[PDB]
């Protein structure tokens, strides 16, 4: 579409420049254009897609939380402005989540056969449904939570069959699914269980790793322990 006239390689190059320039909306737009070329993404390219959209939606989520807090405190009459503006940011956030979900559905997941790509995309699907769940309040909210859960569960089932317990994507998937359980599904015990099991199984596999792999895995393990420290 919009990036239709730019070469795939040039979109990827510009996405890397946009990251360096901290221009994450541009980065996301370039990576969307790259996906829409129709070819599968390499490991590095998947990471660029993910980083771009995590930064865009992360800023939107942070803004939404600031506005939602002000709106909660309001409820002297301030008028409709706080609600209206929270609604505007919410709608934008939903739109970005729907865009990422649409890239996953058209057609990244269905063409992803290797475990690493498929798990990566299914983790993304769980995450963007989780961000939709954070702002959901209407008839479809349970369905949004269930969609997040289903994506994360399929990713977990593949990861446990096909990846070692220290693989960083398997680890980050478990971490984010544990956050889902704690923050979204009102299942703190499931969150704690999953984080502990994940940590312990990773610990027991560190002996197999190179120095560099060890560093990658232990960094994520420390995020699991940080959540366990907060939760227990």
């Amino acid at each position: 579409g919009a990036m239709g006239s730019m070469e795939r390689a040039s979109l990827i190059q510009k996405a890397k420049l946009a990251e360096q320039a901290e221009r994450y909306e541009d980065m996301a737009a370039f990576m969307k254009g790259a996906v829409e070329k129709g070819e599968e993404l390499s490991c590095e390219e998947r990471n660029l897609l993910s980083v771009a959209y995590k930064n865009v939606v992360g800023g939107q989520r942070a803004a939404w939380r600031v506005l939602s807090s002000i709106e909660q405190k309001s409820n002297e009459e301030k008028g409709p402005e706080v609600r209206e503006y929270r609604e505007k940011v919410e709608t934008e956030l939903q739109g970005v989540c729907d865009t990422v979900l649409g890239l996953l559905d058209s057609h990244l997941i269905k063409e992803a056969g290797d475990a690493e790509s498929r798990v990566f995309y299914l983790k993304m699907k769980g995450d963007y449904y989780r961000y939709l769940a954070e702002v959901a309040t209407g008839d479809d909210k349970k369905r949004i939570i269930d969609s997040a859960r289903s994506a994360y569960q399929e990713a977990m089932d593949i990861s446990k069959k096909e990846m070692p317990p220290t693989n960083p994507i398997r680890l980050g998937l478990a971490l984010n699914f544990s956050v889902f359980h704690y923050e979204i599904a009102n299942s703190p015990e499931e969150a704690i269980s999953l984080a502990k099991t994940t940590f312990d199984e990773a610990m027991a596999d560190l002996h197999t790793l190179s120095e560099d792999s060890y560093k990658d895995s232990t960094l994520i393990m420390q995020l699991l322990r940080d959540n366990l420290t907060l939760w227990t």
Partner: peptide, 9 residues
Amino acid sequence: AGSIPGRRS
């Protein structure tokens, strides 16, 4: 608590 930041390539 914390999800993975995921904000740096």
